[PDB]
Amino acid sequence: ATLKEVEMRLKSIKNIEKITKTMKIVASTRLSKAEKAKISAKKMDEAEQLFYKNAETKNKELIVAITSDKGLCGSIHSQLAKAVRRHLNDQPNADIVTIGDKIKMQLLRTHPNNIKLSINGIGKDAPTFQESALIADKLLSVMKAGTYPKISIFYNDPVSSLSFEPSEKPIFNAKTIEQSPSFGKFEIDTDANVPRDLFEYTLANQMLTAMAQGYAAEISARRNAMDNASKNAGDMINRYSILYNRTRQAVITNELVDIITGASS
Amino acid sequence: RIDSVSQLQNVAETTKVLFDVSKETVELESEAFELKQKVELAHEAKAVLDSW
Amino acid sequence: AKSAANKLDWAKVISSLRITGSTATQLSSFKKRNDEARRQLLELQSQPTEVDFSHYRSVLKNTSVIDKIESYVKQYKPVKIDASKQLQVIESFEKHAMTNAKETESLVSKELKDLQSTLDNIQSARPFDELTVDDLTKIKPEIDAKVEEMVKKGKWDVPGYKDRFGNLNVM
Amino acid sequence: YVAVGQKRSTVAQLVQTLEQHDAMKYSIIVAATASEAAPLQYLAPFTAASIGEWFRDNGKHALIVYDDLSKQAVAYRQLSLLLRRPPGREAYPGDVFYLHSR
Amino acid sequence: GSDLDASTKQTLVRGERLTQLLKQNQYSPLATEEQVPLIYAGVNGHLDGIELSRIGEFESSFLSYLKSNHNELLTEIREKGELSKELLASLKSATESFVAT
Amino acid sequence: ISYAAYLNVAAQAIRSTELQTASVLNRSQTDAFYTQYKNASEPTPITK
């Protein structure tokens, strides 16, 4: 009917509302863990950065990127996708390694040469050193990571807990570490494998931090998104409710007219 | 090298058949032009007779 | 009918696939197909070639205009001129073509049997152990030419030797 | 092809279309244009049906399009409401079902 | 916003082509003998790869191709009204031949 | 073997006496298949 088609749709909107409510709450729950992790990760990174700062290291170019493997994250996926494309105007030949299905698809469309390595299954779980390490190891074996005298990694820095800003940072290269202005204030062996090791060690350690930042932005963004979803769905409830209520009255009226007509006869 | 040669060998004879045939077909279409002009004139004649 | 030509044509399309180039062969095939497809669609389009003065004259009250257009149709029963127009040029082009065809054909037939003979010669005498290097000089003075040129050059490195035969070295 | 309730212009175009595709030479076009009486409209499918039955009887196979059958219902609605029969659901007389079924 | 897996997108891709295959312009009936090939091609997924835009082109051209060579085949479909082994094979080969060109 | 891969394997082994947290174990179990991507193309999604 009008009445029934209204009603089934109103029920649909109600169920949607309930789901968006539920998701928003669950997102808050998940967010607490995500943020907690991000603190520890950031502290860990900072010690390595302490070396790089004092070292004043100063960074073909490689691009690595990090996003969710799945939607309903917000605009994390496509704000980063746009910012990659922007920095792919800053290098017209770079190999993009995509950690995350969502960033993978979007970049894959725009340059179907650049996508060289990609991962899948990272985003489902909160970041883990094991994952980051294996990706780093694979980056070395498959892509020969040290060869690139530039590497830059992309992630979404969660600027404020209502925001996410797509962000990049430059991963330092082993050639660079050798010749970095300070590398002599620090003292180590002449039989050192310190370039070939330290590069590799921070390849993962920096990458994990980037993942932690990214994951936190994903969970933060979905919380924001699902909240806004709840508001929009509510408006649709109100609109179909008025329609339902009017339609219900109208059905009564239409029935009454038939009755009156019958009575008159 | 024998493989390359063999492709060319079989082609070389057989192609002359098609060469002739294709041009022969084009000759048939010339005669078809005469058909078209018969068809046209008749159709027109029928149409006027209907108008009358 | 048309189908004999077209089966043989398409058989040749996948044969012409075997040879290289056909950027304007296909335009010729397209032309023969196009116009062949036009004449059949013409022949199916066809109306009877004269008026039905059976029904449509006995309807008409305005007499002897059916007789006029009948006489106009029977006048133009001679349509217009038709002849084999390519009859000098088709024989000339095919003659030239035939010459070229026979030339390629005879060439490849010769080459095929030459390749058979060489294949047989490598099979019936394959040196891969022994056969005097003096005999290799005897079958190729290219050997002595290179040796003399190397001695004249004052170079005892043979490039290519090293890239598929190792060098014994103590360095 | 039975045309009930349609404007003369649609019908005229339709017969023209059928002549255009030269498919007029084996058709019967039964018409009851929009102006034409509600009684004539009510009677129109049923009189088309009999013409069809002449084919059916002959052993001939044929096909009858009843377009729009919906307009028969409107016609019967009018007919009944001015015969002052008690009006059925949505003012279509109840034996509209019977009419259409038969 | 469900991110489809490839298996579902095989179906989706196949499905889209069928939809384009069905469409017919008003006042353009077709001969059933030449509707059987079009469905054979579609159902046997030969059109799945073919780009979405040029499906209509493929349809038109395929029919022309079948008119050109396999006009014997069409006559048989008219005559026997059930596809025989020979017809299925002929049709399969023909369809394959027209996928590219 | 990569130096950091070497450290990684050692860390995974090192969570073995045992008393350990689920989160540690989760941190020591991978859950991914790396999809190598050729030039568009993509060699097999080998379990990372």
From Swiss-Prot, chain A:
One Gene Ontology molecular-function label: proton-transporting ATP synthase activity, rotational mechanism
Subcellular location: Mitochondrion; Mitochondrion inner membrane
CDD domains for the chain: F1-ATPase_gamma (cd12151)
Protein name (record): ATP synthase subunit gamma, mitochondrial
GO biological process, one term: proton motive force-driven ATP synthesis
UniProt keyword Lyase, yes or no: no
UniProt KW keywords: ATP synthesis, CF(1), Hydrogen ion transport, Ion transport, Membrane, Mitochondrion, Mitochondrion inner membrane, Transit peptide, Transport
Species of provenance: Saccharomyces cerevisiae (strain ATCC 204508 / S288c)
Effect after changing residue 163 to I: In strain: D273-10B/A1
Effect listed in the UniProt record for changing residue 253 to A: In ATP3-5; dominant suppressor of the slow-growth phenotype of yme1 strains lacking mitochondrial DNA
Note: Present with 28100 molecules/cell in log phase SD medium.
Main location: mitochondrion
Subunit description: F-type ATPases have 2 components, CF(1) - the catalytic core - and CF(0) - the membrane proton channel. CF(1) has five subunits: alpha(3), beta(3), gamma(1), delta(1), epsilon(1). CF(0) has three main subunits: a, b and c.
Similarity-based family: Belongs to the ATPase gamma chain family.
Membrane disposition: Peripheral membrane protein
Gene Ontology cellular-component annotations: mitochondrial inner membrane; mitochondrion; proton-transporting ATP synthase complex
Curated annotation (Swiss-Prot), chain C:
Classification via Gene3D superfamilies: 6.10.280.70
SUPFAM superfamilies with a match to the protein in the record: ATP synthase D chain-like
GO molecular function list: proton transmembrane transporter activity
One GO-annotated biological process of the protein: proton motive force-driven ATP synthesis
UniProt cross-references to Pfam families, sorted A to Z: Mt_ATP-synt_D
Domain of life where this protein originates: Eukaryota
Cystine residue pairs: none
Protein's UniProt keywords contain Acetylation: yes
Chief location bin: mitochondrion
Gene Ontology CC entries for this record: mitochondrial inner membrane; mitochondrion; proton-transporting ATP synthase complex
Coiled coil: none
Compartments it resides in: Mitochondrion; Mitochondrion inner membrane
InterPro entries named among the record's database cross-references: ATP_synth_F0_dsu_mt, ATP_synth_F0_dsu_sf_mt
Keywords: Acetylation, ATP synthesis, CF(0), Hydrogen ion transport, Ion transport, Membrane, Mitochondrion, Mitochondrion inner membrane, Transport
Subunit structure, as described in the record: F-type ATPases have 2 components, CF(1) - the catalytic core - and CF(0) - the membrane proton channel. In yeast, the dimeric form of ATP synthase consists of 17 polypeptides: alpha, beta, gamma, delta, epsilon, 4 (B), 5 (OSCP), 6 (A), 8, 9 (C), d, E (Tim11), f, g, h, i/j and k.
Additional free-text comment from the UniProt record: Present with 6820 molecules/cell in log phase SD medium.
Annotated family: Belongs to the ATPase d subunit family.
The protein, known as: ATP synthase subunit d, mitochondrial
Swiss-Prot record, chain E:
Cell compartment(s), UniProt: Mitochondrion inner membrane
Function: Mitochondrial membrane ATP synthase (F(1)F(0) ATP synthase or Complex V) produces ATP from ADP in the presence of a proton gradient across the membrane which is generated by electron transport complexes of the respiratory chain. F-type ATPases consist of two structural domains, F(1) - containing the extramembraneous catalytic core, and F(0) - containing the membrane proton channel, linked together by a central stalk and a peripheral stalk. During catalysis, ATP synthesis in the catalytic domain of F(1) is coupled via a rotary mechanism of the central stalk subunits to proton translocation.
Protein family per UniProt: Belongs to the ATPase alpha/beta chains family.
Self-association state and partner proteins as the record states: F-type ATPases have 2 components, CF(1) - the catalytic core - and CF(0) - the membrane proton channel. CF(1) has five subunits: alpha(3), beta(3), gamma(1), delta(1), epsilon(1). CF(0) has three main subunits: a, b and c.
Other remarks in the entry: Present with 41500 molecules/cell in log phase SD medium.
Protein name from the UniProt record: ATP synthase subunit alpha, mitochondrial
Residue numbers of the full-length protein present here: 444 to 544 of 545
UniProtKB/Swiss-Prot annotation, chain F:
Subcellular location: Mitochondrion; Mitochondrion inner membrane
Pfam family for this entry, one: ATP-synt_Eps
Alphabetized CDD domains for the sequence: F1-ATPase_epsilon
Alphabetical list of Gene3D superfamilies matching this protein: ATP synthase, F1 complex, epsilon subunit superfamily, mitochondrial
Function recorded in the entry: Mitochondrial membrane ATP synthase (F(1)F(0) ATP synthase or Complex V) produces ATP from ADP in the presence of a proton gradient across the membrane which is generated by electron transport complexes of the respiratory chain. F-type ATPases consist of two structural domains, F(1) - containing the extramembraneous catalytic core, and F(0) - containing the membrane proton channel, linked together by a central stalk and a peripheral stalk. During catalysis, ATP synthesis in the catalytic domain of F(1) is coupled via a rotary mechanism of the central stalk subunits to proton translocation.
Miscellaneous information on this protein: Present with 4280 molecules/cell in log phase SD medium.
Descriptive protein name: ATP synthase subunit epsilon, mitochondrial
Species: Saccharomyces cerevisiae (strain ATCC 204508 / S288c)
Gene name tied to this protein: ATP15
